[PDB]
Every structure is written in C-alpha cells, then in structure tokens.
Design a binder for this molecule. Structure first.
Ligand code: 7J5
Ligand code: 7J5
Lengths: 245, 297, 97, 48, 245, 297, 49
C-alpha cells in the first residue's frame, strides 16, 4: 500500500510491486510559469501528452566493480521523440521531471544504489593530476546525452565535493533487499523562468552504488539498471528553425 | 471558447506550484516532554526505512525515558544573515612602483569573489543566492604604513570603457560611480545592490554561455555565466605623475539581506582556480581524519 | 524612431549618406536575400546610428520589445512583397527564405 | 533578415532600383537599468 | 476597407493592400473534433501556436506560356517545422488551413489566375495515349510535396474533369488589374474525424492561369507566384515513432 | 486547474463549427417584384468583382423594369432523392454453358457500380455520399427468354469465404444473406443499408490504403479506399449438375435516403476503367460543341 | 511620412501571452541620469611653469 505503485502519464504506464514511496523534490510539484514570473511575451506552446510521457532511454549493467554513472537533464531527451523536436525548434524551454530508476534482483542478491538529483551539476577535471594544469571537461562529458557517463572519482563526485553529503539533495536508495526502484519528482529549478534546453542542464541524475553488488556463483550475474523519465508541464517559446546545439 | 471535455477538464496552465511543506516559527530549540516505558506491539518508532529518502522521525521521547526540559536556546545565530553578514577578504590589488604587474599606477580587477577559500566555501553551500552587499576598501603600503596618498576607485560595469592608463579619459567618471579617498582616511565603504539580470547569482552553472560547436578550444567557457559577471573595479593613484609610494588595496565584502536556494555538499578538496571546481587528481584526500581500525579510537 | 543604418558599409566622407538607406530591385524570383543585421540594440553595428542605441549606451542592462519600421521610397508604380524575419537566439543566419 | 517574397515589379518608364529607409525605436515595455558611461569619449586631446 | 487586410496567426503576420475579401470554404470555419464525432480514445495533442502559423513553402514563376500548378494538403507541410514532426510522430491528424497565394505586378501587366481548392483531388493518367493501357500516376505526382507539380492538360485538370467548372469549389481569382492575392480558409474535409497526414491528401490547391500573363518589352518580366499557408486547429493522436511514409 | 491567462482565454478545443450560411425553405421558384426606373449615383447592382469568388448578386428587378410575377413552379424534382432514386444498370453477370468466363455455373462479382457511364457520371458529381439502396435482379437467357431455372444469389461480405464452385460449401449460407428465386418469378428485389466503416462512401480518394514505399509496382493501389469495398455478390445455378440454359443477370440499383457533400466538376471525357479517372490522352475532346467563328452562330 | 512613430504593438503582430511587467522606469529620470558627479575642470598651480 506504499510498496505497490502505478505511474500513468501520457500513453505510458509504469508499475512496481516493491517501491519505497515517492520523493517530491524540495517539497513542490512541477507547475507552469505564472504571468508574473514570465518575461518573454510570445504565447508559449504546451504540447501536453505528446511530450509529457515516460521515455526509457538507457540501461546500464551493475557490476561488482561499478563506480557509478550520471545523466544530465534535459540533455538526455534533446534528441528523443516529440519532446526533442520542441527543444530543438524553440529557444526557450521549461519543465519538471518524474524520474523512475529500475533495478530488480533476487532475495539472495545484495547491494545499495544511491539515486540523487543535483541541480547545476558542474563537472570538474583532475587538473592534470598535479593540479598545475587548468584543464576543462569536454562536451561529451558535460552533456553525455542518453548514454550518460561513468564517474571517475565517485568519492568527490568528479567535482571536488563529498558524495557522503549528496543526500542533502532529493534522493532515494535502491537497497535490493527492500525495493527495486526509485521515483523522484523534480520541479523546474533555475534562476530564470525559461532557458535553453541545449546550453543549460538544470540538474544531473546520479546513480551510485554505495554498498557493492554481491551474490554467490550460480545466481543471475547480469543485473541491469534502467532509466525511465517523463517531462512534466513542458512549455516552449521563441520559435524558429531546429537547432541541435 | 472551449467545448470538448478533455480541454475543459485539463490542468494545462496551472501556475500555482503546490507545496507539500510550510514554515513554522522556531525561535528556540524544541523542548523535551516527559515519557515513560512503552511495551507495545505495532508501534515501532525506532525502525525506519532510509530507502524512502527521508530522515528518521524518531525522537528522544520514544527511545528512552525522558524528563521535561524547557529549552530556551535561541536559533537566531544560524539565520542566513547571521552566517554571511560578516565581512571577509575577497580581493587584493597591488600597485607597486617597480614591478611586473601594475607599475603604471592603476589596476583593473574583475569582480569575482572566488579567489579566497574561506569566503568561497561558505557561499558554495548554496546554488543560488540573492543579496545586497557592503564593500569596505583597506589601503596601505606593503608594510602596513599609512601614507598621504589620494586614490580613485571606479566601478566599471560591463560595456563601460575600462581605463588603460593612470590618465585615461574614462576617469572623468561622469556616469560610473567613483570614490576618491585618502589612505589616511578610514577605509572607504559603500553599499551595493543586487545587480544581476537573473533573479539570483549562481555559484554553479552547468552549461555554456553561447550556441554552436563546443570544440576543445572553447571548453574554457563551460560553466561561464555572464549573469554573474558584474563588471570591473578600477583603481588609480590620482595624478599625471607616478606615485611616490607602493600600495596595496584589500577588498572586504559583507553580504546583507540574503536569500539562498538549493543547498549542496561542501567543498572537501582544495580549490585551484576561480572559474571552476577542478581538484588535484593525484591528491584526492579523505573528507576528514582517519584511524587504524574501525574497532579502536 | 530614428534612422537605422542597415547599410553601414560605405566609409568615405562623400558616401556617408548612403548608409541611411538600402536598395531593392527586380530579381529573378528565387526568393533572394536583401539584407541582414543583428537585432542587438546596444551592440556595434546598425543600431549605433539610432538615438535608442546611443542612449542605450548609458545603461548596463535593458529589457523590452523593439520595432523597426521600413519605408519604401520607390515610385508609385513600383510594387512588391518582402518577407522580413526575426530569428530568436540560437538560430544561425538563415541560409534561405 | 529581409527576403523577396515575390519580386520588385515596375512598368516601362520607372526606375529599376529604389531605396528603403529603416526607422527604429523601442516599445512601451522597454526599460533600462544600471547607469554606466558610454563606450565612447568624443575627444582626442584637451578640448581648448 | 476590403482591399486592405492583415492575417495574424502564431508568430507570423501577413499584409496586403490589394485584396478581394476572404473566402470561407463551404461557409464554415475550421473547428476541433467534437466528443461525439470522435472515435479514437487517446487524448489528442493540440500544439497550437507552434504549428498553427504561416509557412511560406514555394515560389513559382508565372510565364506567358505557363500551364498551371497544383499542391496537395497536408502533403506540402509533412516535412516542415513542428507541424511536420507532429504529422510524422502521430498516426492521426486533422486540421483546417488558411491559404494565401501572392502575386503582384504593375498597372501595366495583365492576366488572371484561378486559385481553387478541390477536395479528394485524384490524379489520372493519359492511359498510354490510346487509352488502352491502364497506367497509374507515380508517387511524386500524386504527392509532389512543397515543390508542387505542373499540370499537363489543364483543360481537364489531369483527371478527366472540366476546369471550366472548378469555380464550384472554394476559389478566388488574382486579376492583376484588381488584386495581388487570394485568401481561402478551408475547414477539415473528410468522411472520418481524423486520418493519416501521410497516406491521405484531403484536398488539392490549384493555381491556373485562365487569362495569360502579358506585358510590353521593358517591364519586369519575372512575375513570381508565392504560396503561403497556415494550419488551423491542428490536432494529433495515435503517438509512436516518427515515420515519413 | 487553469491559472495563466493565455490558457483561460484560449479557444483551443472549440468543437462548434461556426457556419456563415443557413438553409431557408424554398418550395417554389422565387417571385418577381415590380420595379421602376432608377437613375442614381452610388448605387450600382450591375457592377461586380468576380475576383472575390462569389457569384453575382444582381437580379432582374435591378437590371430592367419588371412586373410582378407570382411564381408557383416547384423545386421538388431537383432534390437529391428525386435525382438519384431511379433504378439504373450497374452490373451484368454472364453464366454461359460453353464459354471462357464462367462456364462452371457460378460467378463472383465485386460490388462496384463504376462499370456503367450513366449511373457513374451522376454519382461522381459529389465527393461523398451516404445512402440506402434498393437492388433489383433481372435474369433471363441471352435472347431474353424466360426458362424454368432456379438461381441462388448470395452476398459475401469482406472476409467471408467466396464460393469457388457451384457445389462450394459456402452456399450453405448459414449466416450470409441469400436469395433463392426462379427466372420465371418476377425480378428479385431487396433493400441494402449503408454499410461503410466511414460516415459516407466516397467516389474519390486522393491517397493510398497502406503505409510504406509506394514504388511503381504498387501504384495500382493509389486511389483505392477499402471503405468503399462492400464485398462480393455471388450467383450460381442450384444443382450439382450443369444447367441446361445459358443465363444473364442484370443488376439495377435505386438509391434512397440520400445525402451528398462537396459538389465537383462533371466528367467530360469518356471513362476507361472502373478504378480511376484515366482518360485517353490522344483524344482529349472539348466539353461540348464548337463553331467556326466567335461572331457567327 | 506623417512624422509619427509606429503605433503597432506586440499584441497585434504575434500571438502573445500575458506578462505582468514590474520593471521600474526610475533610473531613467533626468536626475537619475545627470545627478552623478563628473569632471568638468582642472586647475594647475605649478611652482616653476
Ligand atoms: C566607487 C565604486 O565602488 N564600487 C564598489 C563595488 C564593489 C563591488 C561590486 O560588485 C559586487 C558584485 C559581487 C557581490 C558579485 C560576486 N559574484 C556573484 C556571482 N559570482 C560568481 C559565480 C559563479 N562563478 C564565479 C567565478 N568567478 O567563477 C563567480 C560572483 O563572483 C560593484 C561595485
Ligand atoms: C441475397 C443477397 O442479395 N444481396 C444484394 C446486395 C446488393 C448490393 C450490395 O452492396 C451495395 C453497396 C453499393 C451501394 C456500394 C457501391 N459503391 C460505394 C463506393 N464505391 C466506389 C467508390 C470509389 N471508387 C470505386 C471504384 N470501383 O473504383 C467504387 C462503390 O462502388 C450488397 C448486397
């Protein structure tokens, strides 16, 4: 009655019989931009069902040695379905997100994944190792797309900050002996009412194993982690030709 | 007009962001109520499910037998203004006589407070901040001596001409705000408003400032947010002839009327550069101290 | 409204007045391009000829809609239809109509 | 950008080339903030 | 006051100082599908401003010998802007159209163009000339796209029917001495509430010179005919991956 | 709920199709009113602007001096039912003894009324039509002789098994409707409902029935609309042994309860095939007669 | 030609939304623009000149 759940939006429905409730980032549901917060004057377009639906974008394999991965929003969807087209044809974009991370195993497997959302997740480099070289991360690392990217130094989140304090952000855990999914609802987070879906990534989704995956020889060794997400209250403005970046 | 049902009953356009939580006044630490032994089935405060993502709701009252304690300890000193409204160093400007830096009697400093660790680490606890600020300017020679010298500080906002010499025409300062003061006078001090084009300044921007191909040679612009670039602070000795004294200007900032959003993990690796969170990859250190065994102090 | 120097190319004293107007003429019907310019009001370029652009220079930030009115000074017997477009940020200079 | 939607047409006897004058200004929702000096200083040496 | 007009829809505006009123096909304005005429159960998407706007798709040159051209709807827009994307991602589509045909000249040029809309404009072939061969028109002729297609035998509209009776369809004329444009508003015409934007062309737009273009040596000889059109009340349903045909 | 203004004030979803015109009763031709000479400026009924796309509004009354005429001429005979509800030939089926077509004593006819010009040209005046119909079946030998033979007509809807012989099991007709009649009996006659999956049949379909690449070898499907394919009409002599007589079945159709939409130009070139409007390119003829000069009768 | 500026507004040229504009006009008053001290004169009193 808190373990079972159904998430229906658009022409897609998700089910889970081993949930752990739902998290609503910073305690507030997504919403459309009010006429007093807005600034751009053109009438926005709100596609609704064609873009506010669940998209399953990627599957990673959880291994005994995995370090963790991250994805950037809205980067992950800029080239998928109708949402992508609208993000490409419009200068302005804004929306919320419902993130559903899936990972099931057996009552004999163990391990725990920390699933968290970190706004304005700026990536840092190791500065040439000695820290005397001012290097910068490449586009494929700041905006990895749907395939995401693997963390090199999870302890410091590849940005000189302690992952041990990541729980100060909207998060959930996937502890195999307890639940097989994590659901986080995120409102639009920015210092502006609208912004570019291409140049700016509002937040990053981190999925990091804190307690290593383990099991005995003979049990299914392939344990996938699938990422499904849905935009909420998508709004677009500033129409012109399509642009990919 | 609207006639088909799905349109009439849609929530498309709801601008009211529903909030699950609300603030309550809390001027003092919560009190402790009396409690006694409880030997029940069904009731189990001690057991939690951290997976949910929420913190434990268990309290002293339900874990041990407590007494009543009227707690009048204030919560005042942990407000944002209490924490930040304390002047700290955010900039140094040298005006040497014989040097390799600013030997021409003037200097331009890009307003950027991320050059000093103490102040930087405090503001980076939050992602977005909006505030006014009080700026204090302390001048003296490199020995701390006070000399009879007149200086001119001028705030050059983006787009205004940056002085290129001690006699530059821009010092006419007909529109930009300038302060003329003596090293003998007390430190100059002024109030600065919230000047960003955005609703708040942001210590982190996971994006690029422009469109196009973001090739290797432009990656230095990743994370650069013009909304945070308030301009230049220019200083000069007032005269057509070189100063007789070497000078140093220390800049202190005191935030006030502060609002902050989105807390984040606190820096645990030394800082290296102003513009980014780069860290020395070969010196990744634990967040804190360590010990020999988990079973020994 | 003040005159916008869309045709800001001639620089010799005797031809400065030509900056105040740009031409149109019979084409070959391939939806050819007539002219282009950035809309940025406080930026170096055409807008500098206007009083708006100049006053704009005394302020760091601005906000608002703009308007450009085009007056055709051809003869009464000349007719034509032009497409004037505004491409918001992110859109590169249009290759075609 | 300005493009020809159809074409500039004229009969026998009228110029094949004409000019367009552009006038620009701001709408009533236009405002400006944070006073600063203009990028230009119209003077080379001392003005005598 | 009937000669001057402004058509504003979406982020586009059209002006004309030599109009001849506006025609509203079969006397009825476009409208969304009612809940009693509808049959498909999924909630439709109504993009609004991002697709109901003016699109200028093509320019043809009117010559003294021109025979006439035609375009198919919605074929002409299936690969343009946001409208195209929605037509591709959805099985079901429905909309109305505002057609604005432009052609200006001088008070010394002459000629008249018949601009008409013919629903279910099926194309026929000349059957091998002798009529003993049952040939069929190719895809590029039934659905020519934005470039349209030139009529081979305008007198019979390339379909064994008299163009002299085409005026029984919503139409207007562009008589150079009178007006320089034609504006026709068309509601959705079909025996079904929704249909495929790819397999079915609801109507065809015909632009045929009935009175030949003429002028004296020396006057501008290049006289373009430009086609601008805007969807009205666009609705889409039956979402899935994008398909071009 | 809805809160932002553009959403509250939008017309998105209006299902009420606004109509600029409405029907008025007109059981008789309009009357003529008395009129006199008019010598005015400003008023000019005779001048029109055909470019607009509308027909002239000028009337007798305003072009010549008229008298009063009470017109009681009916408009009844030009209603859709009056025009179409007249039985016409739409199909012929031959059942010869020795032949190359149907020498096995049975025949399958695809229900398609476009094989005959008179009926076809009338229905093609409209794009969409919805109607019920009365079908009459006239049988006899090729000389028009009436012989004592028993026949079986069966309506085989799409998906039902088509008889492949005179003794086919499908003739059990346990569900399909069949008519058993003698050539000696009067013509068989039945009523058929509007059976399309669509709201109307359509004589023209500018599209393809399926998705995919429409290459040369599939162009025969352009214009094919299954919504118009109602099935097969099968006929057979009733017996395990061959009939002793050669037969012909003429099929007549009489539409009733007719509704039509979207009028269109009327066919002016001879028809060649059932499925399409193809015309002989080398014989394109004028719609009507011609003459030597425009100045001579 | 009339000598007046265009009266055309956003509302009539494109489909707009409602925007409550609370941007101040205070900083463009004459006093705001001019009431800022600037250099207007220099006077030299040299010993040997
Ligand atoms: C006589 C005239 O006296 N005039 C005095 C006077 C003093 C100070 C003034 O300006 C104060 C603006 C300060 C508070 C903004 C500091 N901020 C906000 C965001 N940000 C920032 C964010 C992310 N990254 C970086 C980065 N550098 O990588 C940097 C900042 O540094 C102006 C005028
Ligand atoms: C004992 C049992 O007795 N049973 C009798 C019985 C008789 C007649 C029955 O069916 C009558 C259906 C008729 C009216 C539909 C004719 N239609 C509509 C559209 N259409 C059409 C459109 C475009 N193109 C074509 C084309 N051929 O290219 C064709 C037609 O031909 C059924 C049963």
């Amino acid at each position: 009655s808190d373990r079972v759940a159904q998430l229906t939006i658009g022409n897609s429905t998700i089910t889970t019989q081993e949930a752990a409730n739902i998290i609503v980032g910073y305690g507030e549901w997504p919403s459309y931009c009010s006429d007093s917060d807005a600034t751009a004057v053109d009438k926005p377009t709100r596609p609704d069902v064609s873009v506010n639906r669940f998209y399953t974008l990627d599957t990673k394999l959880w291994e005994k040695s995995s370090k963790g991965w991250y994805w950037k929003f809205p980067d992950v969807l800029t080239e998928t379905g109708v949402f992508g087209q609208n993000a490409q044809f419009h200068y302005l974009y804004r929306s919320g997100f419902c993130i559903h991370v899936q990972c099931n195993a057996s009552k004999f497997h163990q391990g725990a994944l920390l699933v968290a959302v970190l706004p304005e997740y700026v990536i840092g480099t190791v500065a040439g190792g000695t820290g005397t070289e001012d290097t910068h991360p490449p586009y494929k690392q700041t905006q990895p797309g749907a395939d995401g990217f693997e963390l090199q130094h999870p302890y410091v989140l590849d940005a000189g900050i302690p992952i041990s304090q990541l729980t100060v952000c909207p998060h959930q855990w996937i502890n195999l002996r307890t639940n097989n999914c994590a659901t986080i609802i995120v409102p639009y987070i920015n210092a502006l009412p609208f912004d570019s879906a291409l140049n700016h990534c509002n937040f990053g989704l981190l999925v990091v194993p804190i307690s290593p995956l383990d099991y005995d020889q003979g049990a299914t060794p392939v344990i996938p982690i699938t990422i499904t997400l849905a935009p909420m209250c998508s709004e677009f403005a500033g129409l012109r030709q399509a642009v990919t970046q | 007009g609207d006639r088909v049902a799905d349109v009439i009953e849609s929530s498309i356009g709801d601008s009211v962001s529903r909030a699950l939580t609300h603030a309550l006044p809390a001027p003092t630490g919560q009190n402790t109520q009396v409690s006694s032994h409880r030997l029940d089935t069904g009731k189990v405060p001690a057991l939690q499910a951290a997976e949910i993502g929420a913190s434990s709701n268990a309290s002293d009252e339900s874990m041990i037998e407590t007494r009543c304690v009227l707690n009048s300890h204030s919560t005042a000193e942990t407000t944002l203004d209490s924490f930040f409204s304390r002047a700290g160093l955010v900039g140094e400007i040298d005006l040497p006589l014989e040097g390799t830096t600013n030997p021409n009697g003037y200097a331009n400093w890009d307003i950027d407070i991320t050059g000093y660790a103490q102040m930087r680490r405090k503001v980076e606890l939050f992602t977005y901040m909006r505030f006014d600020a009080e700026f204090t300017f302390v001048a003296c020679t490199p020995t701390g001596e006070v000399v009879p010298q007149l200086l001119q500080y001028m705030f050059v906002p983006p787009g205004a001409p940056k002085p290129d010499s001690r006699e530059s025409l821009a010092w006419q300062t007909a529109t930009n705000p300038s302060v003329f003061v003596k090293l003998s006078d007390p430190p100059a001090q002024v109030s600065v408003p919230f000047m960003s084009p955005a609703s708040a300044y942001q210590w982190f921007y996971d994006g690029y400032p422009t469109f196009g191909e973001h090739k290797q040679e432009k990656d230095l612009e990743y994370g650069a947010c013009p909304n945070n670039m308030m301009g230049t602070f220019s200083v000069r000795t007032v005269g057509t002839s070189k100063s007789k004294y070497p000078l140093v200007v220390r800049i202190y900032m005191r935030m006030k009327h502060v609002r902050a959003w989105i807390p984040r993990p606190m820096r645990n690796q030394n800082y290296l550069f102003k513009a980014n969170p780069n860290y020395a990859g070969n010196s990744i250190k634990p967040t804190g101290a360590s010990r020999t065994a988990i079973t020994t102090l | 409204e003040t005159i916008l120097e869309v045709n800001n190319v001639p620089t010799n004293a005797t031809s400065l007045m030509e900056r105040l107007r740009f031409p149109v003429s019979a084409q070959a019907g391939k939806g050819e391009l007539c002219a282009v310019f950035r809309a940025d009001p406080g930026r170096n370029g055409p807008w500098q000829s206007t009083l708006l652009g100049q006053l704009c220079g005394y302020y760091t930030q601005w906000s608002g809609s703009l308007e450009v009115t085009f007056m055709f000074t051809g003869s009464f017997m000349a007719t034509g239809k032009m497409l004037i477009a505004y491409t918001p940020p992110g859109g590169p200079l249009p290759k075609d109509r | 950008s300005i493009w020809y939607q159809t074409n500039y047409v004229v009969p026998i006897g009228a110029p094949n080339t004409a000019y367009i004058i552009a006038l620009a200004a701001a709408q009533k929702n236009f405002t400006m903030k944070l006073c600063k000096d203009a990028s230009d200083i119209l003077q080379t040496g001392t003005i005598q």
